[PDB]
């Protein structure tokens, strides 16, 4: 049968799962947020090519968002406490994912916008480093995936 | 001897949480003095050149 | 950075505590003492709903403080010798104060289901108390954290932003949007705590 | 006061108290100084198997009643370690005839050692085993408990596991919770006294 | 019948309430009360214009009384232990949101004086700062009122 | 129903209250005669201005030491427990309030010694702010004394 | 019967007492006397004057004194476990308001030997605040005493 | 025979698994994003030969997420007792040594990519010392993975 | 019956009468040798002056002696802990007494001997400022006494 | 009948041991890699020869990985119980005596490196001190497996 | 009759005699290293005159081993439960007193070395703090000696 | 019939006798290592014979050898549970005492092979304080035997 109140650990791991993206894009959308502000007085051209790490803390935060709603719509009364580690774990780690993919977006997206603003060439290596922390972030969110569906 | 006790600290479960309390109060005072007595400021001013 | 390396020195005294007692543990055969269904069964849902709310409206709040600060003397600061800058960048304010709406609107929610036991036996009654107490302070925890992140970030945003405007005040324009990704993330909070709230109930 | 035994073929049940009274008008009668060193007591209910017995103390006549005590004992099997423990709930009274069961405080543990209780009976101050309403006007009153139900190979007692755990758990969730909110306000601290002044003005 | 230690909780709620509060204005007073103090050399003429933060201080002070009498008239020994929690959270909610508040409104008056000192324009703007700084603050209150008796 | 060590509540929060009183006390003091003793080198009359804080610090003293006796007043082995929770909590309450408004006011006095050096009408804004800071030490006083008889 | 430690908690009273005083007294004797070795260097002829200090050190090195000699005198093998406790409270109390006291003093000290090496009229303001301080050492007697004999 | 929920273990494993080499990861990418950052601009013929550590670093996740889905599909409540923990250290062990692997990846990327600045020949050194802390990684999987299966 | 390991108590008070007494002494003779050694190049005739410091010092131990003696040859088997425990508060007491009045000490020690190397002159008062410490190393042992003859 | 719990005390001695090979090796790395950086800017013919300490980087993973697969294959289903406390100190023993041997391989790399930018003939005394830092590796590796064959 | 584990105390005992004063001897020898270094600038013909401190530093070995050795030679499994308890108090004492005179005499040394490179006539003064120190030790030795005949 | 876990402590002891050991012999050869680095940068006369202190950490290295050795002789499966804390105290003991000799042996090294840079005659001198050093170690070692013998 289901012991009782065999929920707690999903109620939890949703929790963990939102809030530790939370802290992952609040600083992503922070260090670029304030770095273009800076670079864009001198050249305004480069603005909307330069925000692209923002939307991309915004990214790591609807990963949390797909963990979060996939635990709340398995969470139920009736639970084994076996999807309830699960649901935990796959919270802590995407989460935590997304706060090492937050902090290497944001430092590398403003030493990235002002070497842009030094010189324009190097805007597409900067988004293919910036596209590796994506990476990082996606295997995060598929082993959250994996425990949400295990 | 037949293994009895001899009823060590009975109803310890709220004393100990006292002697806790009373540790962690020491703790605190003793740590602000230590600190501000390793570090107290005494100026050391105007003069230190004259012995320097 | 004396007082920090202490608080930094309790922290390490904890954990050392903390491994210590968990050999000894198994070490003299302690049997089950902690017993963690022990633990559960006997705490209560009260401190759960309260504590949601309560940190809902503690960290949405302080979260909007740090907004209100930094954007505040950011542009007053601008203003000594641009003066136009508040007149485009006073809405920061408004938009941290929005933050802290949010969270209140989440802390009314969770209000909504708060009430009292006053059982005793906890073998087969309230079941599904500790599943939504659970939930509340899950909710307030989610809610509260992400105001303050959307605090910060918002803050120091807007402080760039401000005095950036004192050089060239059309960069306004291409700038403020930032703001909304942090909004995003105080809807996202929203959306997860109230889907935390929606199939919750006491019993 | 020596301890008691259920001696069969080998000795099966060991027990001790202090001192023991049992009221059934309200009115105290101390029965320990009617046992321990009494050689005389009517055990016809006695009987005893591998972890499927039963305990039987009968008693004078007083007042124009006969009146027993009675146990049932059942090792119970825990998966978590496949240990067996044991685990009372009950004590069945007669007196005048009638019938009337009595449940039990948390009494539990492994079976491998003996147990204790300072207090044991219904009233609060004293131990707690009380019964689902039925005040009645009878106590049971017994300082000093000690029971071994099972694994006794010899007339000594084993160690006696302690009742209390090793803390209370009533205050320990203030405790906890306070510890949280004490954590915050430190990093609330922190902050507030990140405060620090500013140097002459700029005119 | 009830669980002992059930005013203890009430009383802490009052004292966590009235703390955070007498922490935060005397932050606003600390601060504000620097900036006065060494400015008014060079513009004696923004003394009594001044006082708006500290009032402003003041009134983050005054959330305590209302909410730490309600719990002061109203706390008893007979609690169900709903109650008492009760006000032990939303004595401590109000009150480090007021803790909050005043620690804006302290250093939001000191860089105001400095910056109305150089120039009058940026005072409307300073008090308009202030006031959010108190909106903040109501609702640390309200809610607390709301906890007073849900 | 009145668990023991009862005195212990009520004598913790009286220790505490004049604990935290004598605590504000030296920090107003000390801070105050500091300034007033770098400063009447050069302007010997300052002193009768200067003075009015340690007066004030001493009316802390007097509120941690009139809560010490009240609580005092009301102490045995064995109280019922129910009157010492509040005894305990405000006596630590009022105390710790008082640290917060007496180290607010030190530094403001720091602060405006060095400000009256030249301009002498500046001796009106620092009795402004000192009295309102210490008017918030009779704000926690209130609920100090309203839980010592409830 | 009697709950253990019971007539010991005095004893941890007297040596609390004993601790806050003598790091009180030698802080405030320690910071005030490098101030007057320094003073001699330019004016020896005011060092009698500058001995004041130091002499109300010992005087609340006294008062400590007399609530550790009277906590001494009112101890025994059968307490009734709540004067000990009053005694605890009233130790700790007492020695750390002497140290607070002792900090003020000797920091003040140092600055006011700083200050009267130039004019020997801010002796009055030196003593005026040196007196304070004991006055407040005095409270902390005052309280240790009643809760010592209550 | 088997203690219930032994699989918790497991879950934590993989978690903590991914957990190190995503820590690893983003502290390698932050450093080598913003050492390229500043220098392509005066050496931008070595955009090209800086892919060489971030794919390190991508290498180091990919060893996170095969490790975790490794204990994903080998996890189950039905664990022998003597099967879950295995998961649990071999996860540990191979997400630090991934987190070792970022350190150290990041910081000698960060020499090495200013010793190339200046000089073009050093970068084959420098590949030597990134497949060094490549050997380390992989004998970090060796071991994580003979526990895994056995 | 007597209370679990009480004469350890009595045992870690002779070692506490030990451990602060020593480190005061410790700490008295480090900087007295730093202050001396370095400011007798330039007048060593100092040199008899200075070394009344040094067994100024040492009577703290002296005083710790006849503490930890007492201590000694009052421990036995079987305390009920009545006396033991006196011994334990006793030595941390007169340890730590010491350890203020060598701490102390050796500050206004260095400041007087500095002062002294220019005005020979200030040694008696220097001298005086260290017999009020010692003044507090005699309430310290008069307390130790004390509670070696309770 | 064994315990229950009792494969782990080999599982985490294995990983523990491997733990501190991968801390101490990736330390090595670390500062071969920053002095390697530094020398060949300067002196390109040393730069193979600088490589050196960089395998030695190595061979610390070399004994953690000797040591970790030793207790993986002696692992089995059930265990005496006393090769498995083994397992762990010989773990805990060789991991962190090669984490300070890599500490110290690090910092003579970087004595070495300092050492060889005048003067190539310095290389032999840099292999010499770098051959006195292994052996302590080998050493724990002896002891850890004498215990792992006890 | 007496209990098992009752010898811990013993090597706890002789280990935290020799275990401080081994470190406080390590801390002297550490400082002179430096001192005489700094000697041999310009007084090289007098080095030999301050060996004398690691003289003392052989001499708080001494001290701390007759402790030790002292305590084996009382140790058993069957000790009486008493004299162990002894044995830990007389070696931390000894210990903690071999790290007084420790860093006592260590910077005391470093001092009169450092006095000594000018001026000739430190030469007994000097010897006779540092003797002094010595007395401490002796002293701390004395407590040791009662408590291993107690 | 004996407890489950006999040789823990044992295997623990020897781990701690070792890689103590092995700490100080890192630590010893870190700074002799920068020590010589330097003194044979400046001249190539003394690097082959600055070796010698890194013997003596050669030397640091045995001891622990030693006594693991000893350690894993006197361990085996059921121990009396009386030896095994003995063996504990016995590793503990003499792995402290090699750092002891470890940073002491180092830092006089370094201090004294950077003074032989303009003084060849301090050479002697430093090898005797070095030597010194020795006599602690084997002070510890003794302490070693002792309890190896038991």
């Given at each position: 049968?289901?012991?009782?109140?065999?929920?707690?650990?999903?109620?939890?791991?949703?929790?963990?799962?939102?809030?530790?993206?939370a802290?992952?894009?609040?600083?992503?959308?922070?260090?670029?947020?304030?770095?273009?502000?800076?670079?864009?007085?001198?050249?305004?051209?480069?603005?909307?090519?330069?925000?692209?790490?923002?939307?991309?803390?915004?990214?790591?935060?609807?990963?949390?968002?797909?963990?979060?709603?996939?635990?709340?719509?398995?969470?139920?009364?009736?639970?084994?406490?076996?999807?309830?580690?699960?649901?935990?774990?796959?919270?802590?780690?995407?989460?935590?994912?997304?706060l090492?993919?937050?902090?290497?977006?944001?430092?590398?997206?403003?030493?990235?916008?002002?070497?842009?603003?030094?010189?324009?060439?190097?805007?597409?290596?900067?988004?293919?480093?910036?596209?590796?922390?994506?990476?990082?972030?996606?295997?995060?969110?598929?082993?959250?995936?994996?425990?949400?569906?295990? | 001897?037949?293994?009895?006790?001899?009823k060590?600290?009975?109803?310890?479960?709220?004393?100990?949480?006292?002697?806790?309390?009373?540790?962690?109060?020491?703790?605190?005072?003793?740590?602000?003095?230590?600190?501000?007595?390793?570090?107290?400021?005494?100026?050391?001013?105007?003069?230190?050149?004259?012995?320097? | 950075?004396?007082?920090?390396?202490?608080?930094?020195?309790?922290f390490?005294?904890?954990?050392?505590?903390?491994?210590?007692?968990?050999?000894?543990?198994?070490?003299?055969?302690?049997?089950?003492?902690?017993?963690?269904?022990?633990?559960?069964?006997?705490?209560?849902?009260?401190?759960?709903?309260?504590?949601?709310?309560?940190?809902?409206?503690?960290?949405?709040?302080?979260g909007?403080?740090?907004?209100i600060?930094?954007?505040?003397?950011?542009?007053?600061?601008?203003?000594?010798?641009?003066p136009?800058?508040?007149?485009?960048?006073?809405?920061?304010?408004?938009?941290?104060?929005?933050?802290?709406?949010?969270?209140?609107?989440?802390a009314i929610?969770?209000?909504?289901?708060?009430?009292?036991?006053?059982?005793?036996?906890?073998?087969?009654?309230?079941?599904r108390?500790?599943?939504?107490?659970?939930?509340?302070?899950?909710?307030?925890?989610?809610?509260?954290?992400?105001?303050?992140?959307?605090?910060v970030?918002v803050?120091?945003?807007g402080?760039?932003?401000?005095?950036?405007?004192?050089?060239?005040?059309?960069?306004?324009?291409?700038?403020?949007?930032?703001?909304?990704?942090?909004?995003?993330?105080?809807?996202?909070?929203?959306?997860?705590?109230?889907?935390?709230?929606s199939?919750?109930?006491?019993? | 006061?020596?301890?008691?035994?259920?001696?069969?073929?080998?000795?099966?049940?060991?027990?001790?108290?202090?001192?023991?009274?049992?009221?059934?008008?309200?009115?105290?009668?101390?029965?320990?100084?009617?046992?321990?060193?009494?050689?005389?007591?009517?055990?016809?209910?006695?009987?005893?198997?591998?972890?499927?017995?039963?305990?039987?103390?009968?008693?004078?006549?007083?007042?124009?009643?006969?009146?027993?005590?009675?146990?049932?004992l059942?090792?119970?099997?825990?998966?978590?370690?496949?240990?067996?423990?044991?685990?009372?709930?009950?004590?069945?009274?007669?007196?005048?005839?009638?019938?009337?069961?009595?449940?039990?405080?948390?009494?539990?543990?492994?079976?491998?050692?003996?147990?204790?209780?300072?207090?044991?009976?219904?009233?609060?101050?004293?131990?707690?085993?009380?019964?689902?309403?039925?005040?009645?006007?009878?106590?049971?009153?017994?300082?000093?408990?000690?029971?071994?139900?099972?694994?006794?190979?010899?007339?000594?007692?084993?160690?006696?596991?302690?009742?209390?755990?090793?803390?209370?758990?009533?205050?320990?969730?203030?405790?906890?919770?306070?510890?949280?909110?004490?954590?915050?306000?430190?990093?609330?601290?922190?902050?507030?006294?990140?405060?620090?002044?500013?140097?002459?003005?700029?005119?």
């Open positions: 049968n289901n012991p009782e109140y065999s929920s707690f650990f999903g109620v939890m791991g949703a929790s963990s799962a939102m809030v530790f993206s802290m992952g894009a609040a600083y992503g959308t922070a260090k670029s947020g304030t770095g273009i502000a800076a670079m864009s007085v001198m050249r305004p051209e480069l603005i909307m090519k330069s925000i692209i790490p923002v939307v991309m803390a915004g990214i790591i935060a609807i990963y949390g968002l797909v963990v979060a709603v996939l635990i709340a719509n398995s969470l139920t009364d009736g639970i084994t406490l076996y999807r309830s580690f699960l649901q935990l774990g796959a919270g802590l780690s995407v989460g935590l994912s997304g090492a993919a937050g902090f290497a977006i944001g430092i590398v997206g403003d030493a990235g916008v002002r070497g842009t603003a030094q010189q324009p060439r190097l805007f597409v290596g900067m988004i293919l480093i910036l596209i590796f922390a994506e990476v990082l972030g996606l295997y995060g969110l598929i082993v959250a995936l994996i425990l949400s569906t295990k | 001897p037949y293994n009895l006790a001899y060590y600290n009975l109803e310890y479960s709220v004393v100990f949480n006292l002697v806790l309390w009373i540790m962690i109060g020491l703790a605190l005072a003793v740590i602000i003095t230590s600190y501000n007595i390793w570090n107290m400021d005494p100026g050391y001013d105007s003069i230190i050149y004259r012995m320097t | 950075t004396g007082l920090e390396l202490l608080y930094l020195g309790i390490v005294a904890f954990w050392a505590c903390m491994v210590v007692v968990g050999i000894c543990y198994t070490i003299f055969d302690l049997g089950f003492r902690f017993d963690v269904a022990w633990f559960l069964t006997e705490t209560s849902p009260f401190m759960w709903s309260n504590l949601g709310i309560g940190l809902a409206i503690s960290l949405s709040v302080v909007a403080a740090w907004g600060y930094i954007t505040g003397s950011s542009i007053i600061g601008g203003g000594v010798k641009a136009r800058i508040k007149t485009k960048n006073l809405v920061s304010i408004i938009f941290c104060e929005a933050v802290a709406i949010y969270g209140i609107i989440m929610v969770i209000s909504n289901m708060a009430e009292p036991f006053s059982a005793t036996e906890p073998k087969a009654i309230g079941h108390n500790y599943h939504a107490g659970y939930s509340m302070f899950g909710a307030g925890l989610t809610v509260g954290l992400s105001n303050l992140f959307c605090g970030c803050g120091i945003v402080s760039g932003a401000a005095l950036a405007d004192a050089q060239n005040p059309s960069l306004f324009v291409k700038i403020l949007i930032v703001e909304i990704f942090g909004s995003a993330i105080g809807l996202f909070g929203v959306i997860v705590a109230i889907l935390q709230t199939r919750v109930k006491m019993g | 006061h020596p301890p008691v035994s259920y001696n069969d073929t080998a000795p099966r049940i060991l027990f001790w108290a202090q001192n023991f009274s049992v009221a059934y008008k309200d009115e105290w009668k101390d029965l320990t100084s009617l046992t321990f060193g009494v050689e005389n007591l009517n055990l016809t209910g006695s009987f005893w198997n591998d972890s499927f017995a039963m305990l039987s103390l009968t008693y004078e006549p007083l007042f124009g009643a006969t009146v027993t005590f009675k146990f049932i059942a090792s119970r099997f825990y998966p978590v370690s496949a240990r067996y423990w044991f685990a009372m709930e009950r004590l069945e009274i007669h007196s005048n005839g009638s019938v009337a069961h009595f449940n039990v405080s948390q009494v539990t543990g492994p079976s491998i050692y003996s147990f204790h209780c300072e207090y044991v009976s219904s009233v609060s101050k004293k131990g707690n085993l009380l019964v689902t309403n039925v005040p009645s006007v009878w106590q049971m009153t017994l300082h000093n408990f000690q029971i071994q139900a099972f694994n006794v190979t010899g007339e000594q007692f084993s160690y006696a596991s302690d009742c209390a755990g090793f803390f209370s758990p009533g205050i320990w969730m203030g405790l906890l919770t306070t510890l949280f909110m004490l954590f915050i306000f430190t990093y609330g601290l922190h902050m507030i006294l990140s405060l620090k002044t500013m140097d002459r003005f700029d005119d």
